[PDB]
Scaffold this active site. Structure first.
Site, PDB file in Angstrom:
ATOM      1  N   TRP B  20     -11.217   1.234   7.543  1.00 26.91           N
ATOM      2  CA  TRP B  20     -10.938   0.614   6.234  1.00 26.91           C
ATOM      3  C   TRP B  20     -10.946  -0.909   6.399  1.00 26.91           C
ATOM      4  O   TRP B  20     -11.502  -1.629   5.511  1.00 26.91           O
ATOM      5  CB  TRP B  20      -9.578   1.106   5.710  1.00 26.91           C
ATOM      6  N   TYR B  54     -15.913   0.803   1.643  1.00 33.54           N
ATOM      7  CA  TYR B  54     -15.073  -0.037   2.525  1.00 33.54           C
ATOM      8  C   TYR B  54     -15.757  -1.383   2.776  1.00 33.54           C
ATOM      9  O   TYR B  54     -17.003  -1.436   2.910  1.00 33.54           O
ATOM     10  CB  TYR B  54     -14.745   0.675   3.829  1.00 33.54           C
ATOM     11  N   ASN B 158      -7.300  12.972  -1.205  1.00 32.02           N
ATOM     12  CA  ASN B 158      -6.354  12.717  -2.305  1.00 32.02           C
ATOM     13  C   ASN B 158      -6.412  13.816  -3.356  1.00 32.02           C
ATOM     14  O   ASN B 158      -5.905  13.609  -4.472  1.00 32.02           O
ATOM     15  CB  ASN B 158      -6.632  11.346  -2.920  1.00 32.02           C
ATOM     16  N   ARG B 265      -3.147  -2.637  20.490  1.00 27.60           N
ATOM     17  CA  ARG B 265      -2.578  -1.464  19.763  1.00 27.60           C
ATOM     18  C   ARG B 265      -3.530  -0.275  19.864  1.00 27.60           C
ATOM     19  O   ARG B 265      -3.042   0.871  20.037  1.00 27.60           O
ATOM     20  CB  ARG B 265      -2.271  -1.880  18.327  1.00 27.60           C
TER      21      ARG B 265
HETATM   22  N1  LIG Z   1      -8.796   8.561   1.892  1.00 23.57           N
HETATM   23  C1  LIG Z   1      -8.174   7.476   1.413  1.00 23.57           C
HETATM   24  O1  LIG Z   1      -7.998   7.291   0.195  1.00 23.57           O
HETATM   25  C2  LIG Z   1      -7.680   6.480   2.364  1.00 23.57           C
HETATM   26  C3  LIG Z   1      -6.703   5.425   1.915  1.00 23.57           C
HETATM   27  C4  LIG Z   1      -6.297   4.531   2.959  1.00 23.57           C
HETATM   28  C5  LIG Z   1      -6.833   4.542   4.169  1.00 23.57           C
HETATM   29  N2  LIG Z   1      -7.667   5.556   4.570  1.00 23.57           N
HETATM   30  C6  LIG Z   1      -8.060   5.697   6.005  1.00 23.57           C
HETATM   31  O2  LIG Z   1      -6.886   5.706   6.779  1.00 23.57           O
HETATM   32  C7  LIG Z   1      -6.968   4.680   7.798  1.00 23.57           C
HETATM   33  C8  LIG Z   1      -5.592   4.227   8.200  1.00 23.57           C
HETATM   34  O3  LIG Z   1      -4.943   3.664   7.076  1.00 23.57           O
HETATM   35  P1  LIG Z   1      -4.294   2.214   7.371  1.00 23.57           P
HETATM   36  O4  LIG Z   1      -5.384   1.271   7.725  1.00 23.57           O
HETATM   37  O5  LIG Z   1      -3.347   1.874   6.278  1.00 23.57           O
HETATM   38  O6  LIG Z   1      -3.489   2.445   8.729  1.00 23.57           O
HETATM   39  P2  LIG Z   1      -2.012   2.236   9.327  1.00 23.57           P
HETATM   40  O7  LIG Z   1      -2.122   2.623  10.754  1.00 23.57           O
HETATM   41  O8  LIG Z   1      -1.000   2.895   8.470  1.00 23.57           O
HETATM   42  O9  LIG Z   1      -1.770   0.660   9.123  1.00 23.57           O
HETATM   43  C9  LIG Z   1      -2.657  -0.252   9.793  1.00 23.57           C
HETATM   44  C10 LIG Z   1      -2.194  -1.629   9.399  1.00 23.57           C
HETATM   45  O10 LIG Z   1      -0.883  -1.831   9.974  1.00 23.57           O
HETATM   46  C11 LIG Z   1      -0.904  -2.942  10.854  1.00 23.57           C
HETATM   47  N3  LIG Z   1      -0.029  -2.676  12.000  1.00 23.57           N
HETATM   48  C12 LIG Z   1      -0.208  -1.699  12.947  1.00 23.57           C
HETATM   49  N4  LIG Z   1       0.684  -1.707  13.902  1.00 23.57           N
HETATM   50  C13 LIG Z   1       1.529  -2.745  13.547  1.00 23.57           C
HETATM   51  C14 LIG Z   1       2.683  -3.244  14.175  1.00 23.57           C
HETATM   52  N5  LIG Z   1       3.146  -2.754  15.314  1.00 23.57           N
HETATM   53  N6  LIG Z   1       3.303  -4.289  13.588  1.00 23.57           N
HETATM   54  C15 LIG Z   1       2.785  -4.771  12.446  1.00 23.57           C
HETATM   55  N7  LIG Z   1       1.694  -4.392  11.769  1.00 23.57           N
HETATM   56  C16 LIG Z   1       1.109  -3.351  12.384  1.00 23.57           C
HETATM   57  C17 LIG Z   1      -2.375  -3.155  11.228  1.00 23.57           C
HETATM   58  O11 LIG Z   1      -2.562  -4.550  11.528  1.00 23.57           O
HETATM   59  P3  LIG Z   1      -3.294  -4.933  12.913  1.00 23.57           P
HETATM   60  O12 LIG Z   1      -4.779  -4.757  12.766  1.00 23.57           O
HETATM   61  O13 LIG Z   1      -2.860  -6.458  12.995  1.00 23.57           O
HETATM   62  O14 LIG Z   1      -2.717  -4.126  14.038  1.00 23.57           O
HETATM   63  C18 LIG Z   1      -3.072  -2.783   9.920  1.00 23.57           C
HETATM   64  O15 LIG Z   1      -3.032  -3.827   8.944  1.00 23.57           O
HETATM   65  C19 LIG Z   1      -7.898   3.637   7.184  1.00 23.57           C
HETATM   66  O16 LIG Z   1      -8.450   2.797   8.174  1.00 23.57           O
HETATM   67  C20 LIG Z   1      -8.930   4.554   6.539  1.00 23.57           C
HETATM   68  O17 LIG Z   1      -9.825   5.034   7.544  1.00 23.57           O
HETATM   69  C21 LIG Z   1      -8.121   6.455   3.650  1.00 23.57           C
HETATM   70  O1  LIG Z   2      -9.710   4.778   1.113  1.00 25.16           O
HETATM   71  C1  LIG Z   2      -9.034   3.523   0.959  1.00 25.16           C
HETATM   72  C2  LIG Z   2      -8.939   3.132  -0.486  1.00 25.16           C
HETATM   73  O2  LIG Z   2     -10.171   2.385  -0.723  1.00 25.16           O
HETATM   74  C3  LIG Z   2     -10.149   1.808  -2.066  1.00 25.16           C
HETATM   75  O3  LIG Z   2      -9.023   0.897  -2.111  1.00 25.16           O
HETATM   76  C4  LIG Z   2     -10.056   2.919  -3.161  1.00 25.16           C
HETATM   77  O4  LIG Z   2      -9.876   2.491  -4.502  1.00 25.16           O
HETATM   78  C5  LIG Z   2      -8.835   3.751  -2.938  1.00 25.16           C
HETATM   79  O5  LIG Z   2      -8.789   4.756  -3.963  1.00 25.16           O
HETATM   80  C6  LIG Z   2      -8.882   4.300  -1.514  1.00 25.16           C
HETATM   81  O6  LIG Z   2      -7.791   5.208  -1.385  1.00 25.16           O
END
Ligand SMILES: NC(=O)c1ccc[n+]([C@@H]2O[C@H](COP(=O)([O-])OP(=O)(O)OC[C@H]3O[C@@H](n4cnc5c(N)ncnc54)[C@H](OP(=O)(O)O)[C@@H]3O)[C@@H](O)[C@H]2O)c1
Ligand SMILES: OC[C@H]1O[C@H](O)[C@H](O)[C@@H](O)[C@@H]1O
Ligand SMILES: NC(=O)c1ccc[n+]([C@@H]2O[C@H](COP(=O)([O-])OP(=O)(O)OC[C@H]3O[C@@H](n4cnc5c(N)ncnc54)[C@H](OP(=O)(O)O)[C@@H]3O)[C@@H](O)[C@H]2O)c1
Ligand SMILES: NC(=O)c1ccc[n+]([C@@H]2O[C@H](COP(=O)([O-])OP(=O)(O)OC[C@H]3O[C@@H](n4cnc5c(N)ncnc54)[C@H](OP(=O)(O)O)[C@@H]3O)[C@@H](O)[C@H]2O)c1
Ligand SMILES: OC[C@H]1O[C@H](O)[C@H](O)[C@@H](O)[C@@H]1O
Ligand SMILES: OC[C@H]1O[C@H](O)[C@H](O)[C@@H](O)[C@@H]1O
Lengths: 295, 295, 295
Positions: B20, B54, B158, B265
């Site tokens: 993402w 993305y 979702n 990390r």
């Molecule tokens: N299907 C969907 O709708 C949907 C929605 C959201 C995301 N996704 C998928 O899910 C994946 C994971 O979601 P996410 O990116 O929100 O992951 P997450 O692992 O919940 O959060 C990652 C974020 O937290 C930060 N972080 C991690 N460890 C930290 C720490 N120890 N202290 C402070 N900040 C820290 C990272 O920054 P740093 O880079 O600085 O470590 C990054 O900004 C996405 O990459 C995507 O592939 C899908």
């Molecule tokens: O997948 C990460 C996110 O990407 C975009 O922000 C989409 O609007 C959201 O619906 C999704 O959940």
């Protein structure tokens, strides 16, 4: 007293006696426990509802004192027990949690059998839905307890339809009930899909706190109480009989569980079966309960 | 690293790496993308999670720069991509909307294949449930993509249980996952029927934002963080390992997706698999997450 | 005008004319009722939607005045009626309630047949889900009415999916519709599982109050109205045509029920079928309706 066959292995009285509060009675003597049971039997109420955790894990031992001192008394009753909650009571659990593991279920049933002085219970319920449930492990453990003869039938308590579906998907035995809060104070299940689900499956719910745990009488439900008293006076019974008759009127064959420790109230528990509750009266009371006209 | 077979055609790493934020890294160079992937592979994390939208429709091209410059690297990884969201970015869409048409799905997959420099993706997800979905059209298009070999397996993201049921009703292929938000900050699915549904169907969810997108660390979750740090210190790992272990402990076989762009990390991402998370500890953390005792 | 086959026994016009308000028209004369029906027929709108309770139990008699004075007119139309609500109107019910008993259903249908001057209705709906329903009694009564030829087909109204499932479980006949509120003011069913359920079962919903009962025009929905007017001007129709076209665009084959008593508005009711409603426009209007971007 109407009986209700939950399965080929389990028939309950249509009204059940609950022992959540048996330890709240300052008298927990064998004679006093026997007096409560005998007062139920005198009205054809034969089913007693227990749990491992009740009375800070003493309520089943308090019942056991009654049974152990009265040969043949256990064979006149059905015993419902429950497991799955672990409640803090140095060796106490550090946090209230659920435990639906095969090991905990087995340990809970063995303690239940030792405390009540019997080789079997009639019905075992999972007490609460467990967000960490392994349905395959729990299902296999419940089936094994039915196979052993230690448990005649199994069901659940406070489960949502999806919780009921998930555990039933992992089991040979049919889950024979869901024990859920239902009363003129707790009406959500009649509209939110929880009762419809059980009615479609032809599963009788058991209704816990059918008088709100005494809250119905608090003075907060004056409109409902005015109507129950008027109907009671018309039919020669008390407000409690009418409140229980309200549940018994439902086509889903609700099994109410009364919780009074008062021998005078136990003695009239079956008056609910004397009440005529027509459809218009059921909606009068329902309308008072939800605080507005039906849609 | 544990692998998890989602089907006969798709096996993922139990922990997945999410991209993402790959475009939020001021360095989007092929070498830096390769370094992130190599750091995942070093710990047996082989699955990369992408989407068409993305990085304002650039994140798959940024990954493609890495892959195209490293022959054989794509064949070491699984690629998950998504389609169905159309995001404003003169020729831009006038409103954010969903498009689950066969034509849009096909166009999205062809652009994904060109941008990443491969003839196939491992998993395609419908990104969001579409209130205007024609399940027959979308189902037939997903089945056709599996048949073509361009897509090894299909799932959703979702979706509510009713959304999952409707699309699966129109498809030959089994939907192999639902990618949903799950974390110590986002617990509703454990009780509201969303996880029970998938657990009953033996479908592994993929958990997105398993650290709340970094919100866990914000200072708003001091009680949860105090407990994660204490458990981490006991077991020689960081708070993140414990927060991910919390998801891995669930019997529904949750597949967490981590989103860090920090190579330090990424290097410890697999520490979550070293954590012992007993039932009482799982409920300690759950109780802190929901802010009250279980019922 | 598109027709829609709900079964082998029932075909409706894709747009239906509703008579909830037929008694609110200060003119209830046979000629005025005939004029409304003839204006519908002129546009291929043949289905008329009624209920026993409408017009304080007079609306079906008002329609009956029209039909009885125009030989052959009833054979040009489909009649939908409903039963299950008992509304206070000395002999009046003491509380608004539901009555889904075989006896009440039979009495309601016989009065409907006498008031409208016909030996059959095309579709009978249970008007509201009944918290006291005996699905076996109601199911058997609905099946018996189809068998008698007095009712060509049966369905429900305002049922939740669990209500629909429970009654269908007790019936031989398929329930052919669920008549539910759907409009640019009432969008919950598109996301909350109510529409998905019917779409999965291939059951067309009938949408009641598709213009919010006139609320769309109140001045409270200025952003939605601005967009409907702009699209109307582009395509040479009024805002109402676009608001109805919004429902017709859905793949679930929604059957909107219009409620106007205005002969000028009845005359353009079919303009909705002339509107081109692309996916982006549908989401423009949906986004205005929910007051925020899709997720
Ligand atoms: N299907 C969907 O709708 C949907 C929605 C959201 C995301 N996704 C998928 O899910 C994946 C994971 O979601 P996410 O990116 O929100 O992951 P997450 O692992 O919940 O959060 C990652 C974020 O937290 C930060 N972080 C991690 N460890 C930290 C720490 N120890 N202290 C402070 N900040 C820290 C990272 O920054 P740093 O880079 O600085 O470590 C990054 O900004 C996405 O990459 C995507 O592939 C899908
Ligand atoms: O997948 C990460 C996110 O990407 C975009 O922000 C989409 O609007 C959201 O619906 C999704 O959940
Ligand atoms: N599965 C579950 O999670 C669950 C949860 C709750 C309970 N249960 C079961 O359900 C049973 C019944 O629940 P409950 O105990 O709440 O029962 P209840 O019948 O709703 O309430 C009983 C309480 O109300 C009081 N009461 C009764 N009649 C009264 C009156 N006329 N005026 C004033 N107070 C009156 C009783 O006091 P007196 O003794 O003074 O009469 C007692 O404290 C329990 O015993 C247990 O077996 C199960
Ligand atoms: N199953 C159920 O529970 C249920 C509940 C409600 C209704 N229904 C059915 O659904 C039908 C339609 O519902 P509804 O009557 O609310 O229909 P509607 O089409 O949403 O609203 C009709 C109302 O809006 C007014 N209106 C129409 N166009 C207007 C405009 N351009 N400007 C201002 N006002 C305008 C009409 O007044 P004019 O006559 O002046 O044009 C009338 O009062 C009913 O007739 C009934 O058959 C069923
Ligand atoms: O059908 C139109 C409406 O008629 C009455 O107002 C009923 O109470 C209501 O439940 C129904 O929806
Ligand atoms: O069964 C009666 C009640 O006993 C305890 O208070 C349990 O925590 C509660 O969950 C249960 O419902």
């Amino acid at each position: 007293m109407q009986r209700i066959a939950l399965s080929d292995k389990l028939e309950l009285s249509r009204i059940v006696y609950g022992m959540w509060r048996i330890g709240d009675d300052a008298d927990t003597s064998p004679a006093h426990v026997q007096a409560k049971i005998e007062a139920c039997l005198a009205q054809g109420i034969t089913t007693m509802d227990q749990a491992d955790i009740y009375g800070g894990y003493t309520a089943e031992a308090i019942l056991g004192g009654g049974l152990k001192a009265a040969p043949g008394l256990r064979d006149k009753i059905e015993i419902v027990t429950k497991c799955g909650i672990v409640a803090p009571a140095h060796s106490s659990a550090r946090v209230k949690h659920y435990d639906t593991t095969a090991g905990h279920i087995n340990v809970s049933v063995e303690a239940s059998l030792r405390d009540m002085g019997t080789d079997h219970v009639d019905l075992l319920l999972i007490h609460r839905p467990d967000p960490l449930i392994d349905a395959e492990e729990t299902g296999k453990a419940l089936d094994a307890l039915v196979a052993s003869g230690k448990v005649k039938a199994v069901g659940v308590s406070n489960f949502r339809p999806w919780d009921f579906s998930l555990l039933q998907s992992a089991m040979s035995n049919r889950l024979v009930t869901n024990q859920i809060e239902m009363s003129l104070l707790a009406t959500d299940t009649f509209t939110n899909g929880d009762l419809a689900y059980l009615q479609e499956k032809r599963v009788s719910p058991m209704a816990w706190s059918p008088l709100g745990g005494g809250s119905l009488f608090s003075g907060a439900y004056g409109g409902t109480m005015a109507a129950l008293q008027r109907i009671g006076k018309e039919q020669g019974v008390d407000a409690t009989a009418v409140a229980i008759a309200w549940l018994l009127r439902h086509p889903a064959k609700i099994v109410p569980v009364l919780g009074t420790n008062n021998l005078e109230r136990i003695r009239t528990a079956a008056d609910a079966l004397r009440v005529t509750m027509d459809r218009q009266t059921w909606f009068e009371l329902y309308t008072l309960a939800i605080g507005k006209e039906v849609a």
